[PDB]
Design a protein around this nucleic acid. Structure first.
Ligand code: DCP
Ligand code: MG
Length: 342
DNA sequence: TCTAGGGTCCTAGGACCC
DNA sequence: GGGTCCTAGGACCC
């Protein structure tokens, strides 16, 4: 009664596209991210850069410290998007049960499938191959009875490899599996688990569920399940965004309400444009603004609202700026819309 | 080092509504 | 009182 799940993961996706398009960049440390002056962070880096310890989500500044000779790329969304579109069309040749997770990742459900005598291993290898023919990009993949295991498996032989976990293999695989490797277990959670002497799924199996629920709530349950290989989340494919936003971080903090109003005038047409594409009549459930301050704290202010409306966002922004800023500089401002259910 | 942008899901205080 | 809605913020993911 198993499922067969494949998680497909593009290797260094943005850097790979750049290396493909410009071969001079192959053997050198590169990164797609925003400049230090733009107060940017690294989206992604290729292997030569990763060797210096350069990482996704790393402040560009830390990345030039670790790797002085790093070449920084601003990124080309249209090139990445086109590639991602094509990859998803390839998946569709094998199955309709496709859940994209980002531009570079997707879960496939392949339980039903007559594609390679029902072999998930062979379907995975055939998708990676043919992503390579066609796009000249490599992918890694994981095959497992459930989602979170397929995802962890796609990391085990990257880049340009794959890894399979059979139902028989799950108990041995879990035993010494570090909880920090479970998706949704980030640094705060792992630190908290560690302070209780829980480092592996093995540790968590020896735990009482009620205690994990009382200490952690819903994540306590999820953790207790994942530690045991349990993950019933079905592959979706019918997933739609529930919200849409546009936000910008300025090169220099602002201290004047007119500066905030002016940035909002700039962000608004882009919000309108993006919302138009999924809802022409710009009707919505909530809209609101966000500000981030100099001490990196942020605040959001949204309210029930029938239709995307600029003057209301500006009015809301004035309130937020007058009441919550407390004299600080603002490094970021954003606009946000919550969509109507179904 | 000095911390994006665009999302999901989850919890929580307290107003609202029956 | 208890359910639901509204709102703001945290932790994560890519
Ligand atoms: N914090 C992040 C992480 C990633 N990305 C973007 C850049 C990547 O090219 C793409 C995929 O992200 P991953 O985090 O899966 O990393 P890569 O695909 O870059 O590398 P790997 O081969 O390690 O999966 O999404 C981003 O914008 N911000
Ligand atoms: Mg990836």
């Amino acid at each position: 009664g198993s499922r067969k799940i494949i998680h497909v993961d593009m290797d260094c996706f943005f850097a790979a596209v750049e290396m493909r398009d410009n071969p001079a960049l192959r053997d050198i440390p590169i990164a797609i991210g925003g400049s230090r002056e733009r107060r940017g962070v690294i989206s992604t880096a290729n292997y030569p850069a990763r060797k210096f310890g350069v990482r996704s989500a790393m402040p560009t500044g830390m990345a030039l410290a670790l790797c002085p000779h790093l070449t920084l790329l601003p990124g080309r969304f249209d090139a990445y998007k086109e590639a991602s579109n094509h990859i998803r069309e390839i998946f569709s040749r094998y199955t309709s049960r496709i859940e994209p997770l980002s531009l570079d990742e997707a879960y496939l459900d392949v339980t039903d499938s007559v594609h390679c005598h029902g072999s998930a291993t062979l379907i995975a290898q055939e998708i990676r191959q043919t992503i390579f023919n066609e796009l000249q990009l490599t992918a890694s993949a994981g095959v497992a009875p459930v989602k979170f295991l397929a995802k962890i498996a796609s990391d085990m032989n990257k880049p340009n490899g794959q890894f399979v976990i059979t139902p028989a293999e799950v108990p041995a695989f879990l035993q010494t599996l570090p909880l920090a490797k479970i998706p949704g277990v980030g640094k705060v959670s792992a630190a908290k688990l560690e302070a209780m002497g829980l480092r592996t799924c093995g540790d968590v199996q020896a735990c009482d569920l009620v205690m994990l629920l009382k200490r952690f709530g819903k994540f306590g349950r999820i953790l207790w399940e994942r530690s045991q290989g349990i993950d019933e989340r079905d592959v979706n494919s019918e997933r739609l965004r529930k919200s849409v936003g546009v936000e910008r971080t300025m090169a220099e903090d602002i201290h004047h309400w007119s500066e905030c109003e002016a940035i909002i005038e700039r962000l608004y047409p882009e919000l309108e444009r993006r919302l138009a594409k999924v809802k022409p009549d710009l009707l919505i459930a909530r809209q609101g603004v966000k500000l981030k301050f100099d001490d990196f704290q942020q605040t959001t202010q949204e309210h029930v609202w029938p239709r995307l409306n600029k003057a209301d966002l500006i009015a809301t922004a004035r309130k937020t700026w007058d009441e919550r800023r407390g004299g600080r500089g603002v490094r970021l401002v954003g606009l946000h819309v919550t969509l109507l259910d179904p």
